Amino acid sequence: SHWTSKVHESVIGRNPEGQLGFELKGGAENGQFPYLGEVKPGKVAYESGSKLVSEELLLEVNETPVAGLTIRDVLAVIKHCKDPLRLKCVKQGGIVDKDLRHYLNLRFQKGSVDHELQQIIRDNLYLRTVPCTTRPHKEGEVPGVDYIFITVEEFMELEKSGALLESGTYEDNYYGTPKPPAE
C-alpha cells in the first residue's frame, strides 16, 4: 500500500500564547521530515476532524508543503499562516519513517500520489541546499553556489556519515544533496 495511505488533515488553532500545543522536531538539517513531538491529550486546540498522534510527520501547512524544509522554514511558514492551521500529517510506522535519506531512496510508481509527494519534497530540499559533485568545475559555475566541488574521497566520507540525503551518478561522476545548514 501507498506511503501516503495514512495521510490526513488535522485542523488546529494556536493557544493564547501563540503556541501549537506540541513541539516541532526533525527537519532537513537533521536529515528528517518535520514531525511532532509528544501530543498530550487536551493540550491541542483542535477544530472538528482528525486528531494527531505523537510523532506524526508534517507534510503541509495550509496547503504549503513543508516536508523537506528545515525547522526554521517550517516555523516561518506557520508564522505567516492565519488560524486555523490545516496540517497534512501521516503517522510513522511500516514504510513511513522520519528519515529523509531512506524516504528519498524509495521508488514510487510514476504519476502516483506517492511519487508526486516525493517530487514536492525534493523540490523543497533543493531550495535549501547546494548539490555536491565530484565532476570538475566548468566555465560559468560558481563554487559554493551552483555546486560544492569535492573529491570522490570526500564524497564517500559524506555518504558514509549520512550527510548526503540523496545521491546518484552520471557520466562517471557522483552527484548528491547534503543536509542543509541548521541556522
Binding site: P131, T133, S167, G168, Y170, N173, G176, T177
Partner: peptide, 12 residues
C-alpha cells in the same frame, strides 16, 4: 534549481 545532469543522476 537543479541541472539536467543532477536530475538524471538521481531520478528513479
Amino acid at each position: 534549481i537543479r541541472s539536467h545532469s543532477y536530475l538524471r543522476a538521481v531520478s528513479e
